[PDB]
Amino acid sequence: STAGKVIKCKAAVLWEEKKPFSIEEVEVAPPKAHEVRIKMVATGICRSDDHVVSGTLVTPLPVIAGHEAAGIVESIGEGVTTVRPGDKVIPLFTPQCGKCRVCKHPEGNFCLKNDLSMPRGTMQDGTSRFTCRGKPIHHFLGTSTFSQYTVVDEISVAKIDAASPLEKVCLIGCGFSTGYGSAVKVAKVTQGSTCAVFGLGGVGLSVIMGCKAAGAARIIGVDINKDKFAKAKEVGATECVNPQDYKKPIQEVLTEMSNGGVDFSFEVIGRLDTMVTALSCCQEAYGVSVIVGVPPDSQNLSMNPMLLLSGRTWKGAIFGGFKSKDSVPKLVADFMAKKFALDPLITHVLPFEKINEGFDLLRSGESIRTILTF
Amino acid sequence: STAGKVIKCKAAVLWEEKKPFSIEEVEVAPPKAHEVRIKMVATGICRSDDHVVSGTLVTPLPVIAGHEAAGIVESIGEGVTTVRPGDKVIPLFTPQCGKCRVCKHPEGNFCLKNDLSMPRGTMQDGTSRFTCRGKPIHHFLGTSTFSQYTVVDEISVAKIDAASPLEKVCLIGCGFSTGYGSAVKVAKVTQGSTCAVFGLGGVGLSVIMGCKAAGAARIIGVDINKDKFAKAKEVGATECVNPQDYKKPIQEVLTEMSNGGVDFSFEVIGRLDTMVTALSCCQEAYGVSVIVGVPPDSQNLSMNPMLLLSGRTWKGAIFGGFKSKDSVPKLVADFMAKKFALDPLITHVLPFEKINEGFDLLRSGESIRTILTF
Numbered sequence: 001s002t003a004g005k006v007i008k009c010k011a012a013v014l015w016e017e018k019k020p021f022s023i024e025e026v027e028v029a030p031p032k033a034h035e036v037r038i039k040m041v042a043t044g045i046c047r048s049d050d051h052v053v054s055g056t057l058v059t060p061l062p063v064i065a066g067h068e069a070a071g072i073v074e075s076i077g078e079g080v081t082t083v084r085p086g087d088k089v090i091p092l093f094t095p096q097c098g099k100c101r102v103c104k105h106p107e108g109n110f111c112l113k114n115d116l117s118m119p120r121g122t123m124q125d126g127t128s129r130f131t132c133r134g135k136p137i138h139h140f141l142g143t144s145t146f147s148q149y150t151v152v153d154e155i156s157v158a159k160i161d162a163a164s165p166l167e168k169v170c171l172i173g174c175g176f177s178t179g180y181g182s183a184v185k186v187a188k189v190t191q192g193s194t195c196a197v198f199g200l201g202g203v204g205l206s207v208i209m210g211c212k213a214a215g216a217a218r219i220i221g222v223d224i225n226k227d228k229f230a231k232a233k234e235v236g237a238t239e240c241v242n243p244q245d246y247k248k249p250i251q252e253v254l255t256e257m258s259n260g261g262v263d264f265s266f267e268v269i270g271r272l273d274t275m276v277t278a279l280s281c282c283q284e285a286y287g288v289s290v291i292v293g294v295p296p297d298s299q300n301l302s303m304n305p306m307l308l309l310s311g312r313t314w315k316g317a318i319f320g321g322f323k324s325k326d327s328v329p330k331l332v333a334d335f336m337a338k339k340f341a342l343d344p345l346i347t348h349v350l351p352f353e354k355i356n357e358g359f360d361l362l363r364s365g366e367s368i369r370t371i372l373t374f
Numbered sequence: 375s376t377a378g379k380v381i382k383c384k385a386a387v388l389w390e391e392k393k394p395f396s397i398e399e400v401e402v403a404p405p406k407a408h409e410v411r412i413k414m415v416a417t418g419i420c421r422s423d424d425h426v427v428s429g430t431l432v433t434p435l436p437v438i439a440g441h442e443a444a445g446i447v448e449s450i451g452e453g454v455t456t457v458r459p460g461d462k463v464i465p466l467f468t469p470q471c472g473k474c475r476v477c478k479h480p481e482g483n484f485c486l487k488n489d490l491s492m493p494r495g496t497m498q499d500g501t502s503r504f505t506c507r508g509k510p511i512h513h514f515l516g517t518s519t520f521s522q523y524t525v526v527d528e529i530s531v532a533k534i535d536a537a538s539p540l541e542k543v544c545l546i547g548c549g550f551s552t553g554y555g556s557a558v559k560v561a562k563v564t565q566g567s568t569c570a571v572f573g574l575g576g577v578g579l580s581v582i583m584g585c586k587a588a589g590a591a592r593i594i595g596v597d598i599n600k601d602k603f604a605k606a607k608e609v610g611a612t613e614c615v616n617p618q619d620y621k622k623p624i625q626e627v628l629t630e631m632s633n634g635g636v637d638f639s640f641e642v643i644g645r646l647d648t649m650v651t652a653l654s655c656c657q658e659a660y661g662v663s664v665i666v667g668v669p670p671d672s673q674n675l676s677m678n679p680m681l682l683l684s685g686r687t688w689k690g691a692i693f694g695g696f697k698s699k700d701s702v703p704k705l706v707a708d709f710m711a712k713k714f715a716l717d718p719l720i721t722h723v724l725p726f727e728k729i730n731e732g733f734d735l736l737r738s739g740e741s742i743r744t745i746l747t748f
């Protein structure tokens with residue numbers, strides 16, 4: 001019905017930094033060869049989309065942000081083989097081309113066709129499928145899910161189970177997969193270990209879930225907002241500490257609580273100072289610390305390399321280290337077999353038109369994940 | 375016959391920073407409970423001993439430095455069960471008490487009894503066995519090998535093969551084991567990988583040996599002293615580059631040479647800037663960089679945490695990650711079975727009283743390892 005045609009629909013356009021999204025009419029072009037046009041069903045509000053608004057995460061403006069979603073294929077361009085009209089899909093903000101040296105490496109997932117490193121805000125071919133007010137509008141990470149319809153390259157979409165609940169499994173598109181994979185795949189948390197998770201939002205709670213699934217014995221949640229503790233204990237934290245309650249630096253407290261430093265520590269906030277604190281609190285000879293938080297653009301941290309020379313391992317990852325198009329359909333399969341839960345991450349559900357209210361809920365500290373429905 | 379008596383002998387005493395060592399008559403007390411007095415046979419001159427002279431490495435002065443050595447047990451204190459008089463031994467600058475949380479961890483080697491983190495320059499009991507004209511002289515790392523005789527705690531000595539050549543296997547007390555273990559145990563270099571090694575002194579050559587033994591296909595040596603290149607190629611370097619030859623930063627050069635970043639990089643110099651360059655030059659999604667060089671005391675490096683968020687892994691180690699008392703004997707056994715060579719590291723051999731000439735050779739760039747013989 002809309003196949004082959006330009007679609008007029010509503011999208012939340014971000015014209016400038018530090019301004020509310022503008023819900024307006026946009027024009028979405030039909031998919032070109034190897035492209036897929038998706039009707040959005042649900043999308044979650046991740047702190048990284050807020051980072052685009054605050055200027056913490058730099059990408060070309062104006063833009064249609066949103067990267068944690070799920071929808072249904074409206075149409076496909078010529079040559080698409082992996083999805084068909086009517087399929088349920090989750091856009092992949094980290095692509096999986098399958099051909100590059102990273103895609104072919106057993107541990108790499110940061111496909112070289114990404115639009116994260118040197119962001120163009122385009123499709124793979126360097127052009128946009130979005131027009132608003134007569135102007136081209138950038139895409140965001142090959143996804144742009146804050147629109148009733150979006151167009152993505154084939155390497156940036158996965159087909160998922162036909163019966164999945166898209167108002168839940170959109171979290172597999174970012175927050176849950178990132179946290180869970182950061183513990184289970186990137187850190188490789190071991191049975192009986194002690195973990196410290198800095199930041200108890202959606203992604204930090206997912207980290208907790210993966211640490212529990214890996215059989216960690218102690219999982220210490222750290223947050224300056226003590227309203228986050230109850231849910232963190234429900235999904236596995238054995239203790240929670242607020243840095244503001246102590247006179248000494250939290251890395252000291254955590255080192256003492258863990259009788260010399262934790263096995264695995266995770267920075268899931270996005271601050272240079274917690275990145276170093278988190279590295280310091282893991283045991284000096286064999287501790288591992290994983291950076292998951294996105295720090296303010298172009299800013300360097302300062303640290304003493306003696307933290308590493310004693311034996312610590314410091315690493316980071318995007319999307320919990322998962323190869324996105326292989327992993328996402330398996331994650332959905334596992335969710336449908338109830339191998340993990342997504343409901344504890346969802347605190348609020350709102351219609352898409354109330355996106356600004358959804359960002360206010362995140363910014364006030366009140367929500368974990370607001371899911372927006374179209 | 376000297377058992378249980380004070381031994382008067384010669385040691386090299388460093389009285390203050392940035393002065394030549396001073397060959398002095400010292401008194402070495404007999405070993406107390408669980409202590410081992412050793413007659414030195416051979417000691418190598420490591421760049422970390424030169425860091426005490428330059429103030430790069432801070433430790434209480436005056437001191438008897440030296441930590442890479444081998445010798446023969448002259449006597450043992452009460453309660454010693456792991457060595458006897460006459461045994462060949464290598465002093466361990468990182469102890470292995472076998473009882474702490476690190477010694478029990480499968481991967482940890484930075485025993486909590488070490489005297490590295492907050493150096494006291496004493497025996498484990500907080501006192502010194504060394505006196506020079508009535509003045510107590512500090513120990514260094516519980517070894518102090520620049521002395522005809524030294525005393526060490528039993529957790530800082532290993533028994534080795536009675537047939538081993540001490541003027542070669544002293545290198546297993548530091549340089550060889552550190553470089554080789556950094557490659558084969560800490561980085562876990564893989565078959566067919568590309569490695570970059572920054573610093574082609576004794577420890578960097580040992581890293582190259584380990585990379586070649588691990589099956590690396592390409593091993594790129596990096597040094598500003600091109601006279602180091604021939605010997606690096608003899609032990610496995612497939613290419614060598616001098617950063618001074620280029621009008622662009624070497625991390626860019628190495629990323630182009632490696633078609634987008636190396637698999638494994640090693641900093642084996644001790645500079646903040648080469649630590650960040652070495653991290654940068656490993657592939658951004660799966661590369662691994664290991665810090666091996668010792669940087670200037672109390673100085674922090676500055677780096678962008680996005681280098682880790684893409685996927686890199688950064689780590690460091692002391693002594694190649696080997697649990698020292700367990701691994702030293704097995705490394706000597708492997709040397710005896712011709713599993714690796716130690717002659718390629720040894721460029722000069724001097725009597726002990728020519729220690730300052732040995733350090734001049736290191737500082738001028740002309741030597742790799744000078745072995746001082748007693």
Ligand SMILES: NC(=O)c1ccc[n+]([C@@H]2O[C@H](COP(=O)([O-])OP(=O)(O)OC[C@H]3O[C@@H](n4cnc5c(N)ncnc54)[C@H](O)[C@@H]3O)[C@@H](O)[C@H]2O)c1
Pocket residue numbers: 046047048051174175178198199200201202203204222223224225228243268269270271274291292293294295317318319320368683
């Ligand atoms: N690496 C990836 O692939 C990836 C994927 C998703 C999100 N992220 C990033 O991870 C971070 C967390 O995302 P989120 O959606 O869970 O965010 P969020 O805002 O819901 O949660 C962050 C938590 O940090 C806590 N916090 C703030 N300052 C703190 C401090 N000084 N100490 C301790 N806790 C503090 C807050 O109270 C909050 O609960 C963000 O920076 C986001 O951009 C990265």
Ligand SMILES: NC(=O)c1ccc[n+]([C@@H]2O[C@H](COP(=O)([O-])OP(=O)(O)OC[C@H]3O[C@@H](n4cnc5c(N)ncnc54)[C@H](O)[C@@H]3O)[C@@H](O)[C@H]2O)c1
Pocket residue numbers: 309420421422425548549552572573574575576577578596597598599602617642643644645648665666667668669691692693694739742
């Ligand atoms: N982590 C440990 O357990 C351990 C053990 C032994 C040695 N170390 C440290 O390892 C480092 C190497 O020790 P070594 O005995 O081989 O020393 P070395 O001085 O023989 O070798 C250092 C090499 O660095 C090269 N170099 C210096 N500045 C450079 C620059 N800007 N760029 C490129 N190359 C440069 C020199 O020309 C030299 O060949 C030292 O810092 C030493 O303290 C650490």
Ligand SMILES: CCCC[C@H]1CC[S@](=O)C1
Pocket residue numbers: 046048049057067093116141174294318319683
């Ligand atoms: C600068 C790296 C940004 C990475 C974030 C992009 C959206 S997802 O939340 C991870």
Ligand SMILES: CCCC[C@H]1CC[S@](=O)C1
Pocket residue numbers: 420422423431441467490515548668692693
């Ligand atoms: C402060 C770290 C020093 C580490 C070095 C001590 C002697 S060995 O060369 C490694």
Ligand SMILES: [Zn+2]
Pocket residue numbers: 046047048049067068174175
């Ligand atoms: Zn996200």
Ligand SMILES: [Zn+2]
Pocket residue numbers: 095096097098099100101102103111112113
């Ligand atoms: Zn790829």
Ligand SMILES: [Zn+2]
Pocket residue numbers: 420421422423441442548549
């Ligand atoms: Zn050394």
Ligand SMILES: [Zn+2]
Pocket residue numbers: 469470471472473474475476477485486487
């Ligand atoms: Zn120990």
